[PDB]
Design an enzyme around this catalytic site. Structure first.
Site, PDB file in Angstrom:
ATOM      1  N   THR A 197      46.140  24.810  10.762  1.00  0.00           N
ATOM      2  CA  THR A 197      45.582  25.208   9.477  1.00  0.00           C
ATOM      3  C   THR A 197      45.609  24.055   8.481  1.00  0.00           C
ATOM      4  O   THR A 197      46.660  23.444   8.262  1.00  0.00           O
ATOM      5  CB  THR A 197      46.375  26.398   8.940  1.00  0.00           C
ATOM      6  OG1 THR A 197      46.760  27.242  10.036  1.00  0.00           O
ATOM      7  CG2 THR A 197      45.538  27.201   7.954  1.00  0.00           C
ATOM      8  N   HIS A 234      47.749  23.843   3.639  1.00  0.00           N
ATOM      9  CA  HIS A 234      48.515  23.733   4.906  1.00  0.00           C
ATOM     10  C   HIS A 234      48.331  22.301   5.423  1.00  0.00           C
ATOM     11  O   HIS A 234      49.116  21.885   6.299  1.00  0.00           O
ATOM     12  CB  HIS A 234      48.038  24.787   5.915  1.00  0.00           C
ATOM     13  CG  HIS A 234      48.981  24.995   7.053  1.00  0.00           C
ATOM     14  ND1 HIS A 234      48.583  25.570   8.245  1.00  0.00           N
ATOM     15  CD2 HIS A 234      50.294  24.711   7.189  1.00  0.00           C
ATOM     16  CE1 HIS A 234      49.612  25.631   9.066  1.00  0.00           C
ATOM     17  NE2 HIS A 234      50.674  25.109   8.442  1.00  0.00           N
ATOM     18  N   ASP A 294      61.977  33.576 -10.406  1.00  0.00           N
ATOM     19  CA  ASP A 294      62.269  33.899 -11.802  1.00  0.00           C
ATOM     20  C   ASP A 294      61.874  32.714 -12.672  1.00  0.00           C
ATOM     21  O   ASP A 294      62.344  31.596 -12.431  1.00  0.00           O
ATOM     22  CB  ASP A 294      63.776  34.195 -11.937  1.00  0.00           C
ATOM     23  CG  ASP A 294      64.155  34.941 -13.225  1.00  0.00           C
ATOM     24  OD1 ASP A 294      63.286  35.326 -14.022  1.00  0.00           O
ATOM     25  OD2 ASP A 294      65.366  35.161 -13.427  1.00  0.00           O
TER      26      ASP A 294
HETATM   27  C1  LIG Z   1      60.205  30.631  16.404  1.00  0.00           C
HETATM   28  C2  LIG Z   1      60.926  31.636  15.532  1.00  0.00           C
HETATM   29  C3  LIG Z   1      59.854  32.514  14.933  1.00  0.00           C
HETATM   30  C4  LIG Z   1      61.842  32.470  16.402  1.00  0.00           C
HETATM   31  O1  LIG Z   1      62.688  33.336  15.703  1.00  0.00           O
HETATM   32  P1  LIG Z   1      63.756  34.231  16.400  1.00  0.00           P
HETATM   33  O2  LIG Z   1      63.242  34.767  17.621  1.00  0.00           O
HETATM   34  O3  LIG Z   1      64.254  35.142  15.427  1.00  0.00           O
HETATM   35  O4  LIG Z   1      64.897  33.233  16.788  1.00  0.00           O
HETATM   36  P2  LIG Z   1      65.874  32.354  15.880  1.00  0.00           P
HETATM   37  O5  LIG Z   1      66.583  31.536  16.792  1.00  0.00           O
HETATM   38  O6  LIG Z   1      65.186  31.701  14.824  1.00  0.00           O
HETATM   39  O7  LIG Z   1      66.848  33.314  15.140  1.00  0.00           O
HETATM   40  C5  LIG Z   1      67.695  34.283  15.728  1.00  0.00           C
HETATM   41  C6  LIG Z   1      68.269  35.291  14.730  1.00  0.00           C
HETATM   42  O8  LIG Z   1      69.155  34.656  13.857  1.00  0.00           O
HETATM   43  C7  LIG Z   1      68.583  34.444  12.605  1.00  0.00           C
HETATM   44  N1  LIG Z   1      68.498  33.003  12.409  1.00  0.00           N
HETATM   45  C8  LIG Z   1      68.693  32.117  13.377  1.00  0.00           C
HETATM   46  N2  LIG Z   1      68.541  30.881  12.965  1.00  0.00           N
HETATM   47  C9  LIG Z   1      68.260  30.973  11.683  1.00  0.00           C
HETATM   48  C10 LIG Z   1      67.984  30.001  10.663  1.00  0.00           C
HETATM   49  N3  LIG Z   1      68.021  28.722  11.017  1.00  0.00           N
HETATM   50  N4  LIG Z   1      67.709  30.449   9.433  1.00  0.00           N
HETATM   51  C11 LIG Z   1      67.686  31.747   9.165  1.00  0.00           C
HETATM   52  N5  LIG Z   1      67.935  32.670  10.063  1.00  0.00           N
HETATM   53  C12 LIG Z   1      68.218  32.356  11.315  1.00  0.00           C
HETATM   54  C13 LIG Z   1      67.200  35.026  12.705  1.00  0.00           C
HETATM   55  O9  LIG Z   1      66.828  35.690  11.543  1.00  0.00           O
HETATM   56  C14 LIG Z   1      67.228  35.966  13.870  1.00  0.00           C
HETATM   57  O10 LIG Z   1      67.644  37.262  13.480  1.00  0.00           O
HETATM   58  P3  LIG Z   1      67.093  38.660  13.971  1.00  0.00           P
HETATM   59  O11 LIG Z   1      67.124  38.723  15.420  1.00  0.00           O
HETATM   60  O12 LIG Z   1      68.044  39.511  13.307  1.00  0.00           O
HETATM   61  O13 LIG Z   1      65.769  38.818  13.412  1.00  0.00           O
HETATM   62  C15 LIG Z   1      61.735  30.927  14.439  1.00  0.00           C
HETATM   63  O14 LIG Z   1      62.780  30.163  15.003  1.00  0.00           O
HETATM   64  C16 LIG Z   1      60.885  30.026  13.614  1.00  0.00           C
HETATM   65  O15 LIG Z   1      60.597  28.939  13.981  1.00  0.00           O
HETATM   66  N6  LIG Z   1      60.503  30.492  12.468  1.00  0.00           N
HETATM   67  C17 LIG Z   1      59.438  29.880  11.734  1.00  0.00           C
HETATM   68  C18 LIG Z   1      58.527  30.813  10.982  1.00  0.00           C
HETATM   69  C19 LIG Z   1      57.572  30.041  10.118  1.00  0.00           C
HETATM   70  O16 LIG Z   1      57.889  28.953   9.791  1.00  0.00           O
HETATM   71  N7  LIG Z   1      56.429  30.577   9.751  1.00  0.00           N
HETATM   72  C20 LIG Z   1      55.561  30.078   8.712  1.00  0.00           C
HETATM   73  C21 LIG Z   1      54.581  28.995   9.182  1.00  0.00           C
HETATM   74  S1  LIG Z   1      53.524  28.307   7.954  1.00  0.00           S
END
Ligand SMILES: CC(C)(COP(=O)(O)OP(=O)(O)OC[C@H]1O[C@@H](n2cnc3c(N)ncnc32)[C@H](O)[C@@H]1OP(=O)(O)O)[C@@H](O)C(=O)NCCC(=O)NCCS
EC number: 2.3.1.-
Length: 434
Positions: free
Chosen positions: A31, A153, A385
């Site tokens: 994007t 983006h 805020d």
């Molecule tokens: C790929 C991804 C989606 C996978 O998420 P996931 O399957 O929940 O796996 P994670 O290892 O991140 O996290 C495991 C758990 O611990 C929490 N957690 C782990 N690492 C974390 C971190 N670094 N920060 C906050 N929370 C975290 C998660 O909320 C999750 O909890 P849940 O099972 O209760 O929902 C995630 O790691 C990621 O990269 N997020 C990016 C989203 C994003 O950036 N989107 C916008 C793009 S413009």
């Protein structure tokens, strides 16, 4: 319904580094249009006697000193590449008034007809006239306020855009930066060769291939034209516990670590879309997952790294395997595609893009047979805020979004964009075929 609209250009409040600024590969793929977020506020208390619009403009000007790339313009380079000109040309800020009421809104969710609230962008204009940042504040008739923020983006991912917005609120309240931005994209080898690979890389990532078409046709214009629709589908905490325990029961699950919420919901969604689309069993299908690499690299990216650090990774299967297997199979495909993303994986992905002859084939806006599920579950959206108080709602405008439910901890809402022909069947399986 809108009664006033007046548009201003905002430049940093102090001189800033000026010049040419190269961008990471992740900046130039995926994007490159604007991420839109909406914030709604109740009528400020009688305590508040500040000036809403002036607080916004002034603090935006000050926060643009620390985030000065946001005030620049893009310019094309050869081979579909582009760079940033830090020229402090500025961002667009719009003050608007409405004769609608906050109470007129049926509910709050990424929905159309909100376009009077969002600054609209003309992406056919020449690139050096397109601001990378646009904001509109709107005063409603009984004192409610809305603020939409729209940020390219092409220069940030969602994490860094929300960092910018959060610091904007902090500075409008007169207190210091929480996280200082790290602005030097050389840390991601922007415009520079990667270190040498110890072992020569195998370029086998699924996302290097182009997504499949429907088995009959040879390109995807027919599917791209079809009428879609967005629906918001909640999932309660207990529905999520059911889905999760069902997925963890599958022997594809990880022992000692269950499937996450993202993995479970995304596998469920993929299976439901497949059922709803009525594909032949051999139909290839690919699902795109956004993955924040900041902490996945070694060394991890610096705290407050400001830019695109997110890449879209692909899991793939066939419609018949997904439908016919249990939920844990689909979830394990999502989970495996995520666990693949190590430091080596990221570097190989960057090297692939560095060596591609044209990035235009990785840019601009996917759908049926394919899918994308974007996690918004960890983005620091809430408590902005300026201050007349925190917002009472905020949200964004083939992709579906997994949003947290701001009113029940642990519950989520899927914002689903699917074709009208398939939405009803999708909803049915989404809740029933739990
Ligand atoms: C790929 C991804 C989606 C996978 O998420 P996931 O399957 O929940 O796996 P994670 O290892 O991140 O996290 C495991 C758990 O611990 C929490 N957690 C782990 N690492 C974390 C971190 N670094 N920060 C906050 N929370 C975290 C998660 O909320 C999750 O909890 P849940 O099972 O209760 O929902 C995630 O790691 C990621 O990269 N997020 C990016 C989203 C994003 O950036 N989107 C916008 C793009 S413009």
């Amino acid at each position: 319904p809108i009664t006033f609209r007046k548009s201003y250009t905002i430049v940093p409040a102090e001189p800033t580094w000026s010049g040419r600024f190269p961008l990471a590969e992740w900046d130039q793929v995926g994007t490159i249009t604007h991420i839109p977020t909406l914030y709604f506020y109740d009528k400020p208390s009688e305590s508040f006697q500040g000036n809403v619009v002036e607080i916004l403009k002034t603090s935006l000007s000050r926060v643009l000193v620390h985030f000065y790339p946001m005030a620049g313009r893009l310019r094309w380079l050869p081979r579909g590449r582009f760079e940033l000109n830090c020229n402090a040309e500025g961002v667009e800020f719009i003050e608007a008034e409405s004769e609608g009421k906050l109470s007129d809104f049926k509910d709050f969710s990424p929905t159309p007809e909100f376009e009077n609230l969002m600054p609209q962008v003309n992406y056919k204009n020449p690139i050096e006239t397109i601001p990378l940042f646009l904001a509109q504040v709107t005063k409603f008739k009984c004192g409610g306020i809305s603020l939409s923020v729209n940020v390219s983006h092409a220069i940030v991912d969602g994490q860094s855009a929300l960092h910018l917005i959060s610091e904007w609120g902090r500075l409008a309240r007169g207190e210091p930066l929480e996280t200082v931005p790290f602005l030097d994209r050389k840390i991601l080898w922007a415009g520079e060769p990667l270190p040498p690979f110890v072992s020569p890389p195998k370029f086998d990532h699924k996302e290097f291939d182009q997504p499949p078409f429907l088995i009959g046709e040879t390109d995807n214009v027919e599917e791209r034209k079809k009428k879609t629709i967005v629906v918001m589908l909640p999932l309660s905490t207990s529905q999520l516990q059911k889905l999760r325990s069902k997925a963890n029961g599958s022997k594809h699950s990880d022992p000692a670590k269950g499937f996450t919420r993202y993995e479970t919901v995304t596998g469920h969604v993929w299976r439901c879309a497949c059922k709803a689309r009525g594909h032949s069993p051999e139909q290839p299908t690919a699902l795109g997952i956004c993955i924040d690499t900041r902490s996945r690299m070694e060394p991890p990216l610096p705290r407050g790294y400001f830019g695109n650090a997110t890449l879209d990774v692909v899991a793939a299967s066939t419609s018949g395997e997904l439908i016919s297997n249990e939920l844990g199979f689909a979830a394990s495909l999502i989970s495996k595609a995520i666990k693949n993303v190590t430091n080596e994986y990221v570097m190989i992905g960057i090297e692939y893009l560095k060596n591609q002859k044209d990035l235009k084939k990785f840019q601009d806006l996917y759908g049926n047979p394919n899918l994308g599920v974007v996690s918004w579950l960890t983005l620091p959206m809430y408590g902005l805020d300026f201050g007349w108080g925190k917002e009472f709602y905020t949200g964004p405008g083939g992709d579906s979004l997994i949003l947290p439910d701001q009113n029940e901890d642990g519950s989520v809402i899927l914002a689903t964009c699917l074709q009208v022909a398939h939405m009803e069947a999708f909803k049915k399986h989404f809740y029933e075929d739990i």
